[PDB]
């Protein structure tokens, strides 16, 4: 009476062990522990989504829109959050676009979900509901697709993909943010027109390098490299033009000693006389090789040594350090060279081409630069991004990857396949999943009906982040999608979106005019992945935790 | 702010010493931390809170005049507006949340006048010249209540003092419910005064059916218990005489010091009865004045019970005092201390009893009342509130009380102002005009001081979760019109203000919201004078306690 | 543990006859007779109820003599009072003694002018209370503002005498614990 | 500088009402298994020891004491449930928490104002009380056979519906004798008297008009059993009463000390003889009495029995009619008690009782329960308090409703065919209410093991061809009507339900900021 028996047939497993069974309301605690970072996600989804400030332990500090970067330093407790996590992380990796959405989506369909398993639906029946849902929706997002790209290259088309990308990530202003990015595609791309050849496309093509000071104005596309070097025998503005040549070695520029045991050894003095002058004569032959073909910098992959760069700055031969394996390789892709670890000859079909290498003060530190020219053109370019606050050029930086990684979708499938963006494609899967549910019999209509109640997050989301009541501009919407035998044949009624900013009422002035689409490959795995986070997290029971 | 200064360098001081602008910035803080808790329960889109006691014990509460109370503060800035939120229930009774609000927004706006090296001195001054050209145009303004020939001048004035309240839904039950109780319980002093005791009503803790079933007494109801088990509860018919006794009925000792002492043992006996015996003689005579109900102050022994059980007489023990002053107030007896005269003899006279027509008990969720209706000589009232539970009945019974404050005042002051931030966004296009008139320093005083009295219609559409600048830009348009009206009614623009439930601006005379302008013409003094013991302190002293 | 002791600690002779009909003859009586021999104790050591007025002589034997008592050490209290008839605060003091004097019969009360007492005594200082107990000085109490000075109680002066082990805390006869029979009567009624 | 020795943080915004509607919602949880006929019972280990077995809703939330103050709120609503009727307390709590839980989907995605949702509750409450009327009927009140099935209402969920028969007579004869004429129906539970006697047989019992006493006669020679006893009820005490004057004598003479004892003696003498001025044969007093005195009250016969409370001496003063008087010299034979019989004390083991029986229309009487363990005791003995709760409102008002589940259907199929006719701001939470009144036909399907979501999809096709009666059953779960089996409940337990669920919801929802540190 004063104390119970504290759970007999406990010391079968440990202390910290617990189990959380379905029962005791805990699936509907899973669904509030959703519900805790979920409404944090509200208010990051949109053109007028709000940054996040995440202070870890080492102090570092990152201010960021995006769910998936602000998941990976949160450390969880509750695992059906991590399923979370690592759902939006598997988004950024494959399509690198779309990850408010999964969290957004795979938060309210559990949010759904906590009315449905209340009614007393069975979890089989959950899945096998929002399953029957998926490939319904996957087949009407292929339907309702207008428009297409059908070329690799053009000024005006790019303004069209990159625009709608960058909007929800740092918007400012939507110019001098979009020109950036159009620019650089087009230098790295191999166009190859009337060819028959296979595109190719890489992500780590386009690096942002970052640098402190000046304005987000001031940022110019570079069409070679920059790094933070200081040439170290010269410098030199480089004025002559007939361009120079390039040798890559990647191995250092000194004497290659033996790998077991190098120690000199001299039995008499004729031998100590000629080991010191032996040494300056074998590093001055090597370069009589190297200075002939007429070659005027060499990018060095480890540390040089002194008396080797005594020769090389004698015929005014740059320096440049590259201690790392990948920074060396970035580089030979832009002149087109091919290394050798050999310290002879360099061949003349290897070596690369390079006009000018520049070095002028931007954030008062030294800098060297491989601008090339319209003629003979190169690949993994780079970008000027300025800025006054280090935080602001991380999620920047961030949002041109999302924008080059954007591109990428559209190399593998067979073109753009663009959609109506602005919640026009969330809106018209409402209807066409509603009237998919009067069609199929069963208990399950009631799992397709609360399918399509979990998409109307999106036009809630943004009327809610752009200061509007949502409680008008939402049923207003829904008139143009509930109209009928309205005069015009060619039917413009499925532009109609959410606005953030200007006319009453809200639906928008079509998408159209405005130029903001979104790509079909990021909805079907976003739907895909988004599916499976509600799957894993509904058709689990049981839990079992330790030591906490 | 930024760090702890300098403990007595070179002073000597056994407690702390700090000075400069440091302090005015954390007085600024100091009257905004304890004004946020006021912010939200503005208006009546404003919720409620709860304050926890550390024992289990809790209380819902909205006004702030009562939070500011429980709330314990150790700052002695932040005491002046606890003081303040209690100097305001004591003499309107309402608009304790409005105070604390408008004196903090006074003191945080003439907050960045005190950086610019303009003086307390003349801030103050043209805060005050604003003041009392405020008060004059509230003179100008406002409205006797007789109005119209229909009342509702009395169902619309408890709208305002019932909003922001648990029944603010139900306030179209309780706007006929408190105008019939303080018209029934109305005075006559100083030769035609009239007056309204506040607080003369019973507000009892009931609990059953719901807020909107509470049924309005005709008359007054007395909160106790019965004595015995074996009494009538019900007593009917016409002329029930009321009795209202204090002095002691029980068995008690002689003289605070005296000691009995007797050398017969014969008369030992005789003393104990005539002592049992002398109490049972004033019990006798009650009887032959034929009191069908008597009330005591004090406790009723058993030897007493036994002829009011006999004589089918109502004993009830365990009464109050300021409650038995009202009873005879109300059913027309006179307070009984002792029953004497100005002879030497000793008798009790049918002109001390009171009459009423009915007198009932009635149980009600383990809450026994006994309901006496039907006095002759001047009416009674009483409200029984029903609810969830005592804690929920405590909002309820200072809503009550708020509403009988204010229906008190209009009717002593037939002046009354429309609400919804009017007379508050009228000032501000009043004194932008008189602002320029007064020509040197005293502009900006006056400029911010108009610019901190529309917090009040700001804060409205803050808690509304609403766009505010529309609805403030659309009430400074036709503010703006008023003082340029050109007259000739055709005199609009006047008399609008919020309406949060819809969102438009609409007119008040015609919604039914109206409160008396003594409330406005104290809380600006009071909010003032608040202000200026702020203002004026410049280094702080704190001695710590030996 | 608790409930079984407040059967008998918390009830004297008279309240214990409650529990006549409820628990047992032999358990009950046992402790009546435990309790009645207490009683009769106090009613031997009831050898006061009025206030002494001695002088000085007499001082040497009376308040000291009787702090010895029977020198069985039993022990006697004697609280003196050096009275002095201009200040407010002795004629106050005067009248709890008399007060607690008919109540407490086996403490002795012991008054005396202040002028009489000893040479030269500062007149400031008065009223004195002193409180002897087997020839020791317990207490030495200076003027009455430690007991609320000009509105001194009866029930700040009983609480004095269970500081310095004159009384003790759970006496049926101090006011703190002497709860009222209205008091009793509605505790029952509720319960 | 803390400013604030209270709580100086604050948690405001939506987080504190996610924790006041989850903490709603968790109260309801542990006590959703506690409706139907198929209904769990619970345990509850006190601090001070004394365990209970229960299955009602007032006494699980009473003895579980909580920290959350948002809960509370919750926790009060059995009480004032209690009082107010003492039956259906568990359908407050779970239609509360549903009713919050239903609302908790609208600050979160719609943003609606909560005091639009008070307009809304309010409005749904008036529609609520008046559909209520139009479901209820009245029926014949005079009817013994009609009143058995309606006290077997509330009795099918708890324990004692095996011993149905015996505990609707018991209850219907405890109740009509303490019912009067004159609200018309003023009688209360605390004239009602229920002894619990552990041991014996609970198929024995019987409704015995009067007050069992648990003493014996103070005197071994009284008679035990009288044929024709008077009653008479005294507060004064046989001892001798000591005054309070603290009177000290002063004797002199050798002759005073044995005076003042046999004064005493006289006094006593005096004092029997006028008991025995009417004669009496059986005597009450609230106080001692002295061992002097039982030997002058031989000779009369006047049996005596000490130290009874003062609640029972009322009791015992409605059964005989006796009247209370405190001293011996207003003895008249009208105060003598009249018209009782069959005084006989049965001897047991335990504790000695008294039995008493009649041949000022106020009455009483003592249910003598038997039983199998003191726990069980507290179980049957609330029973008793639910059995005549559910007979009061039937009594005070002719009106009648039907219940499991068929009542609170009927709300949510009327407010559901108006939700869609209002077209307004306010219909969101108004289609809330009609959705809130589900949980308990549902939670009576589940508990019985059934499948609620074709069960109850059917059960709205059949409420919408124009039908209110049909209800739920709780063990098999059928669509059967109500009429045949005879589930019926007052109006009263309902009207409550709904008012106190809507105003309990309205203190609730207007809560964003939670403070703590006051220490008053
Ligand atoms: N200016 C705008 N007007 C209307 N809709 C917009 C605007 N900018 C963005 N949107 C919409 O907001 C949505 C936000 O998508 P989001 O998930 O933030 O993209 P990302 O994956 O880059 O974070 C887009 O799908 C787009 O349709
Ligand atoms: N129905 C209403 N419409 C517009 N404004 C209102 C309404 N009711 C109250 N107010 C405003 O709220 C302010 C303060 O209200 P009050 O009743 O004092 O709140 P509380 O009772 O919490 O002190 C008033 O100045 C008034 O203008
Ligand atoms: N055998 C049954 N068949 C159908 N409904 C039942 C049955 N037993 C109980 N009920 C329903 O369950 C409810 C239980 O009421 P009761 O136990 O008295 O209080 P509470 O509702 O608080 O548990 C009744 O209102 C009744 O309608
Ligand atoms: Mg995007
Ligand atoms: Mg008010
Ligand atoms: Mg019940």
Known sequence: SLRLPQNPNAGLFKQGYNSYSNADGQIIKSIAAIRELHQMCLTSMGPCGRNKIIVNHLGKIIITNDAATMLRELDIVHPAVKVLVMATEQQKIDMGDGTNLVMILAGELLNVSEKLISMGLSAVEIIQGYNMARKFTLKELDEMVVGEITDKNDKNELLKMIKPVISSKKYGSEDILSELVSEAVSHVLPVAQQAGEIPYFNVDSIRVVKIMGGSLSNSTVIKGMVFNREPEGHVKSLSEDKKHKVAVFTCPLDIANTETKGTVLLHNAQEMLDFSKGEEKQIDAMMKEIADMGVECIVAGAGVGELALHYLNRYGILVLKVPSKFELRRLCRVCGATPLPRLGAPTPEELGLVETVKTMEIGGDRVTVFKQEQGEISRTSTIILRGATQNNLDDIERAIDDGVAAVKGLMKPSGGKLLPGAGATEIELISRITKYGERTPGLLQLAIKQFAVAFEVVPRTLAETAGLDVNEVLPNLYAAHNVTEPGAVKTDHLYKGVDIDGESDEGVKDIREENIYDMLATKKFAINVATEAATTVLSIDQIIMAKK | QLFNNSRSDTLFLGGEKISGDDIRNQNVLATMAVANVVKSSLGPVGLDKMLVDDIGDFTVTNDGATILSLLDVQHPAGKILVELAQQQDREIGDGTTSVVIIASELLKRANELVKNKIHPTTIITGFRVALREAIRFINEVLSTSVDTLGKETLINIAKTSMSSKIIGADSDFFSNMVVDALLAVKTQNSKGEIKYPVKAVNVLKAHGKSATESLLVPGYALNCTVASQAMPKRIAGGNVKIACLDLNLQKARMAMGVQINIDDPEQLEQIRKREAGIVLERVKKIIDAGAQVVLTTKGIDDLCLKEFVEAKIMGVRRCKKEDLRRIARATGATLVSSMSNLEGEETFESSYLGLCDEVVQAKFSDDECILIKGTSKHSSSSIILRGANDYSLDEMERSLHDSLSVVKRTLESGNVVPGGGCVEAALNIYLDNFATTVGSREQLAIAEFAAALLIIPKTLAVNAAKDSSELVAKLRSYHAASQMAKPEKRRSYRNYGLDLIRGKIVDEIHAGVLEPTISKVKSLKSALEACVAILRIDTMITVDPE | ?191 | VVFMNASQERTTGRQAQISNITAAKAVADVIRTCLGPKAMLKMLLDPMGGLVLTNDGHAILREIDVAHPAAKSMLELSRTQDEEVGDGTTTVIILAGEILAQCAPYLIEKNIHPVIIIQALKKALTDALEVIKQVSKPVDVENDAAMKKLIQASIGTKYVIHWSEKMCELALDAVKTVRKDLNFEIDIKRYVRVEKIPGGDVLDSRVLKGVLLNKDVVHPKMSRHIENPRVVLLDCPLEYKKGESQTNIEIEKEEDWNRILQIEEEQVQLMCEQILAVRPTLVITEKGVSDLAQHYLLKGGCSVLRRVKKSDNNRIARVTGATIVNRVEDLKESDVGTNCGLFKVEMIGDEYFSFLDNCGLQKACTIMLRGGSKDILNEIDRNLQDAMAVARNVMLSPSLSPGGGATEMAVSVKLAEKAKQLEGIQQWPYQAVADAMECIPRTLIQNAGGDPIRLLSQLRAKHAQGNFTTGIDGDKGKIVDMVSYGIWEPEVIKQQSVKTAIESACLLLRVDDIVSGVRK
């Open chain 3, 1 to 191: 543990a608790k409930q079984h002791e407040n059967r008998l600690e918390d009830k004297d002779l008279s309240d214990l006859e409650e529990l006549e009909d409820d628990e047992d003859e032999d358990f009950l009586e046992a402790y009546k007779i435990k309790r009645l021999n207490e009683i009769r104790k106090l009613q031997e050591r009831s050898k006061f109820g009025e206030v002494f007025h001695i002088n000085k002589p007499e001082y040497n034997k009376e308040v000291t003599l009787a702090s010895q008592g029977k020198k069985d050490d039993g022990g006697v209290y004697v609280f003196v009072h050096l009275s002095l008839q201009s200040k407010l605060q002795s004629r106050i003091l005067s009248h709890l003694f008399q007060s607690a004097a008919c109540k407490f019969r086996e403490i002795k009360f012991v008054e005396i002018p202040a002028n009489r007492a000893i040479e030269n005594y500062p007149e400031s200082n008065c009223p004195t209370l002193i409180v002897y107990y087997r020839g020791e000085v317990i207490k030495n109490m200076i003027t009455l503002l430690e007991l609320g000075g000009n509105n001194s109680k009866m029930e700040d002066f009983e609480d004095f005498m269970v500081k310095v082990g004159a009384v003790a805390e759970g006496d049926n006869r101090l006011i703190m614990n002497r709860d009222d029979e209205e008091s009793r009567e509605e505790r029952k009624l509720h319960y």
